Design an enzyme around this catalytic site. Structure first.
Site, PDB file in Angstrom:
ATOM      1  N   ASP A  29      58.238   5.858  44.913  1.00 51.17           N
ATOM      2  CA  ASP A  29      59.629   5.641  45.313  1.00 51.17           C
ATOM      3  C   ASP A  29      60.246   6.776  46.128  1.00 51.17           C
ATOM      4  OD1 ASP A  29      60.635   3.018  44.010  1.00 51.17           O
ATOM      5  OD2 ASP A  29      59.490   3.994  42.424  1.00 51.17           O
TER       6      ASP A  29
ATOM      7  N   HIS B 123      56.820  -3.124  31.010  1.00 49.69           N
ATOM      8  CA  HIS B 123      55.839  -2.024  31.080  1.00 49.69           C
ATOM      9  C   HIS B 123      56.443  -0.619  30.968  1.00 49.69           C
ATOM     10  CE1 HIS B 123      52.615  -4.741  32.021  1.00 49.69           C
ATOM     11  NE2 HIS B 123      53.213  -5.186  33.115  1.00 49.69           N
TER      12      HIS B 123
ATOM     13  N   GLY C 145      54.349  -0.188  36.517  1.00 47.38           N
ATOM     14  CA  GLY C 145      54.248  -1.610  36.838  1.00 47.38           C
ATOM     15  C   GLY C 145      55.551  -2.283  37.288  1.00 47.38           C
TER      16      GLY C 145
ATOM     17  N   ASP D  89      54.166 -13.136  30.417  1.00 42.52           N
ATOM     18  CA  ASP D  89      53.767 -12.501  31.680  1.00 42.52           C
ATOM     19  C   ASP D  89      52.238 -12.477  31.808  1.00 42.52           C
ATOM     20  OD1 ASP D  89      55.351 -10.446  33.767  1.00 42.52           O
ATOM     21  OD2 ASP D  89      53.258  -9.849  33.467  1.00 42.52           O
TER      22      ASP D  89
ATOM     23  N   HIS E 170      50.579  -9.982  32.515  1.00 36.29           N
ATOM     24  CA  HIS E 170      50.134  -8.657  32.050  1.00 36.29           C
ATOM     25  C   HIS E 170      50.528  -8.383  30.620  1.00 36.29           C
ATOM     26  CE1 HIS E 170      50.485  -8.402  36.487  1.00 36.29           C
ATOM     27  NE2 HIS E 170      49.346  -7.726  36.373  1.00 36.29           N
TER      28      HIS E 170
ATOM     29  N   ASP F 199      54.133 -14.456  37.096  1.00 36.18           N
ATOM     30  CA  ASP F 199      52.938 -14.060  37.828  1.00 36.18           C
ATOM     31  C   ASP F 199      51.675 -14.695  37.244  1.00 36.18           C
ATOM     32  OD1 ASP F 199      53.239 -12.399  35.533  1.00 36.18           O
ATOM     33  OD2 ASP F 199      52.933 -10.512  36.663  1.00 36.18           O
TER      34      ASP F 199
ATOM     35  N   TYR G 282      55.498 -12.676  41.891  1.00 39.03           N
ATOM     36  CA  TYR G 282      55.371 -11.984  43.171  1.00 39.03           C
ATOM     37  C   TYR G 282      55.182 -12.971  44.322  1.00 39.03           C
ATOM     38  CZ  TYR G 282      55.331  -8.284  39.902  1.00 39.03           C
ATOM     39  OH  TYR G 282      55.732  -7.458  38.870  1.00 39.03           O
TER      40      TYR G 282
HETATM   41  C1  LIG Z   1      49.330  -3.000  45.516  1.00 37.97           C
HETATM   42  C2  LIG Z   1      49.286  -3.539  44.077  1.00 37.97           C
HETATM   43  C3  LIG Z   1      48.047  -2.948  43.401  1.00 37.97           C
HETATM   44  C4  LIG Z   1      50.587  -3.292  43.283  1.00 37.97           C
HETATM   45  N1  LIG Z   1      50.814  -1.851  43.258  1.00 37.97           N
HETATM   46  C5  LIG Z   1      51.658  -1.244  44.085  1.00 37.97           C
HETATM   47  O1  LIG Z   1      52.316  -1.872  44.912  1.00 37.97           O
HETATM   48  C6  LIG Z   1      51.761   0.263  44.007  1.00 37.97           C
HETATM   49  C7  LIG Z   1      53.246   0.619  43.934  1.00 37.97           C
HETATM   50  C8  LIG Z   1      51.070   0.799  45.271  1.00 37.97           C
HETATM   51  S1  LIG Z   1      49.491   1.398  44.737  1.00 37.97           S
HETATM   52  C9  LIG Z   1      49.859   1.201  43.111  1.00 37.97           C
HETATM   53  N2  LIG Z   1      51.027   0.778  42.850  1.00 37.97           N
HETATM   54  C10 LIG Z   1      48.933   1.475  42.005  1.00 37.97           C
HETATM   55  C11 LIG Z   1      47.878   2.388  42.031  1.00 37.97           C
HETATM   56  S2  LIG Z   1      47.126   2.313  40.482  1.00 37.97           S
HETATM   57  C12 LIG Z   1      48.219   1.105  39.878  1.00 37.97           C
HETATM   58  N3  LIG Z   1      49.098   0.805  40.832  1.00 37.97           N
HETATM   59  C13 LIG Z   1      48.128   0.566  38.481  1.00 37.97           C
HETATM   60  N4  LIG Z   1      49.319  -0.289  38.388  1.00 37.97           N
HETATM   61  C14 LIG Z   1      49.261  -1.569  38.695  1.00 37.97           C
HETATM   62  O2  LIG Z   1      48.215  -2.083  39.067  1.00 37.97           O
HETATM   63  C15 LIG Z   1      50.546  -2.367  38.548  1.00 37.97           C
HETATM   64  C16 LIG Z   1      50.611  -3.557  39.485  1.00 37.97           C
HETATM   65  C17 LIG Z   1      51.782  -4.442  39.112  1.00 37.97           C
HETATM   66  C18 LIG Z   1      51.693  -5.380  38.154  1.00 37.97           C
HETATM   67  C19 LIG Z   1      52.914  -6.225  37.840  1.00 37.97           C
HETATM   68  C20 LIG Z   1      53.246  -6.135  36.328  1.00 37.97           C
HETATM   69  S3  LIG Z   1      54.492  -7.413  35.889  1.00 37.97           S
HETATM   70  N5  LIG Z   1      50.758  -3.065  40.875  1.00 37.97           N
HETATM   71  C21 LIG Z   1      50.419  -3.851  41.894  1.00 37.97           C
HETATM   72  O3  LIG Z   1      49.967  -4.977  41.772  1.00 37.97           O
HETATM   73  K   LIG Z   2      51.974 -11.097  28.524  1.00 34.04           K
HETATM   74 ZN   LIG Z   3      53.083  -9.099  35.287  1.00 36.79          ZN
END
Ligand SMILES: CC(C)[C@@H]1NC(=O)[C@]2(C)CSC(=N2)c2csc(n2)CNC(=O)C[C@@H](/C=C/CCS)NC1=O
Ligand SMILES: [K+]
Ligand SMILES: [Zn+2]
Ligand SMILES: [K+]
Length: 359
Positions: free
Chosen positions: A82, A124, A132, A159, A161, A248, A287
């Protein structure tokens, strides 16, 4: 007896202010409004959470950090994605947190039996860390508020997740039972929530996790959900319910894991509603923006006991509903990877755990 709908134009604006999932709150409300469902609900303006209220769960350090950067723009608080704009996160958090607390207070006050905050559900977030797309765990705040009145709370998280932030928050208590159905696979976020994760200490057996594989569709999902919730309800005898309905899981989501439609989730919702308990309804992930609005609008119809027109009505975001412009979502042509023997094992394992639960 009319459901409470947490809404104001200012709140929708604030919920979209970080642009993490651009304009989604406005799309959801706009579609609900286009079907005129808000006319059938009691519209309640949310309060903004105080520092004290947010601090019932989140640490002072984390909250003071959010407030500091709101004023002036190093510890890991989960905010490293961010950097272009952190100054709005404090007000966003206070808005989401306040809205879910407001919904909970409506339930406490007996204003309604169902209270809806479709822009909450950020399951999360940790006491001291964003995770997340979750910056404040409004679901935890809502449960904590409900616990002022109701002696046992059931949290159900549908969800895609694992609801790790909420489970962790109540891991050590037997007064709140968390149930999460989610994708569980090595490498898949957040990595927790195997069926053997049952909570800790006095809370042992008061966490329930249902790990599911890619490709699950409505019928099998409902069979699993109904099986678990029947056992949970008999064992735990909840007095109020917080239900997270992250979209999702729905076919077409970029997460591309489950293969659900809103009708399947709606059957789960109906099963919970027929308990006739105070119920706090939350959104969460989702999403594919148009599909998430389709889903939560359809579920709002379910709550109201209404059948909605298949045609999406003209409204601000109508162009986003192509190419077919209808409310129904068609499952993807992908295989279901859930083998029936493993699902039955999981259900049997959960049944054994719940035998321990004695009120
Ligand atoms: C590009 C995608 C992988 C997206 N992520 C991102 O846009 C960013 C902000 C950019 S790279 C990153 N986060 C990242 C590196 S490691 C990690 N995230 C582990 N966290 C998740 O995978 C959560 C996951 C979200 C889950 C919704 C939970 S309702 N995020 C994402 O689907
Ligand atoms: K769940
Ligand atoms: Zn989710
Ligand atoms: K618990």
């Amino acid at each position: 007896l009319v459901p409470v709908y947490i809404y104001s134009p200012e709140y929708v604006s604030m919920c979209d202010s970080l642009a993490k999932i651009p304009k989604r709150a406005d799309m959801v409300h706009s579609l609900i409004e286009a079907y005129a469902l808000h006319k059938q609900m009691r519209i309640v303006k949310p309060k903004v959470a105080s520092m004290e209220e947010m601090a019932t769960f989140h640490t002072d350090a984390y909250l003071q950090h959010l407030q500091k950067v709101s004023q002036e723009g190093s510890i890991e608080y989960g905010l490293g994605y961010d950097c272009p704009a952190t100054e709005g996160i404090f007000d966003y958090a206070a808005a989401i947190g306040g809205a879910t607390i407001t919904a909970a207070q409506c339930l406490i006050d007996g204003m309604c039996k169902v209270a809806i905050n479709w822009s909450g559900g950020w399951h999360h977030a940790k006491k001291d860390e964003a995770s997340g797309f979750c910056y404040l765990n409004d679901a935890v705040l809502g449960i904590l508020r409900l616990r002022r009145k109701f002696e046992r709370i059931l949290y159900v998280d549908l969800d895609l997740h694992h609801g790790d932030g909420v489970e962790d928050a109540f891991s050590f208590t037997s007064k709140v039972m968390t149930v999460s159905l989610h994708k569980f696979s090595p490498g898949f976020f957040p990595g927790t929530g195997d069926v053997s994760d049952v909570g800790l200490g006095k809370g042992r057996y008061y966490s329930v996790n249902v790990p599911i594989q890619d490709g699950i569709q409505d019928e099998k999902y409902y069979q699993i959900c109904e099986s678990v919730l029947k056992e949970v309800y008999q064992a735990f005898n909840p007095k109020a319910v917080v239900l997270q309905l992250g979209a999702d899981t729905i076919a077409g989501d970029p997460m591309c894991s489950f293969n659900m439609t809103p009708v399947g989730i709606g059957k789960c919702l109906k099963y919970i509603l027929q308990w006739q308990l105070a119920t706090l309804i939350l959104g969460g992930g989702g999403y594919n923006l148009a599909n998430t609005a389709r889903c939560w609008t359809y579920l709002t119809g379910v709550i109201l006991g209404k059948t909605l027109s298949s045609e999406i009505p003209d409204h601000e975001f109508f162009t986003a509903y192509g190419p077919d412009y209808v409310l129904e979502i068609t499952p993807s042509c992908r295989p279901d990877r859930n083998e029936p023997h493993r699902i039955q094992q999981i259900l049997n394992y959960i049944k054994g755990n719940l035998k321990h639960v004695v009120i």
